[PDB]
């Protein structure tokens, strides 16, 4: 349910967070108990330092994975088709395989989400996602930890800065 609409709207490309919403969103998913929190660097450093939301999930992923073990690499597909975002008719660029750089391909590179929406295909009951690979490489307790922390993060997001509702102007 709303842990899937929360994570799909935070991991979308245009979600930018200031240092204080980045934090308090990492620590509220972690609630960490031992050791420093390993933070990331702003994606945008200049006009105003800003984060990406995929960076929040990243930095939540590099703290949960056990200290001695190293972050995982993962390549897969998202549930939301790359055609769901096509508002306006698509035009043709001669060297562009539109899917080389699409929100449909999930690319986690050393525990850092670099591309993809991370909908039900991960976090969900679908196989070969992020949590299924976590359960393969690092065991079943680490996948449970990932599930807990991701639930808490996606709840804090909808409860603090965003909101989900279903009115009549979306069924109209």
């Amino acid at each position: 349910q709303d842990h899937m609409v929360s994570g799909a709207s935070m991991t979308t490309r245009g979600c930018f967070f200031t240092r204080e919403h980045y934090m308090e969103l990492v620590y509220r998913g972690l609630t960490d108990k031992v050791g420093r929190v390993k933070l990331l660097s702003p994606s945008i450093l200049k006009p105003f330092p800003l984060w990406t939301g995929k960076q929040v999930v990243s930095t939540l992923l590099i703290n949960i994975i056990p200290e001695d073990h190293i972050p995982l690499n993962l390549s897969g597909k998202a549930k939301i088709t790359g055609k769901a975002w096509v508002k306006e008719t698509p035009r043709s660029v001669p060297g562009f395989n539109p899917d080389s750089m699409c929100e449909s391909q999930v690319i986690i590179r050393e525990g850092e989400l670099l591309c993809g929406v991370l909908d039900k295909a991960h976090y969900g009951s679908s196989a070969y996602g992020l949590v299924h690979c976590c359960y393969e490489i690092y065991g079943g307790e680490t996948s449970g930890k990932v599930l807990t922390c991701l639930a808490r993060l996606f709840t804090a997001y909808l409860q603090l800065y965003r909101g989900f509702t279903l009115g009549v102007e979306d069924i109209l």
């Binding site: 349910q1 929360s6 279903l166």
Partner: peptide
Amino acid sequence: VAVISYTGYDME
């Protein structure tokens, strides 16, 4: 009633 996902305890 507000139709909102806000708590984490109102699901399912």
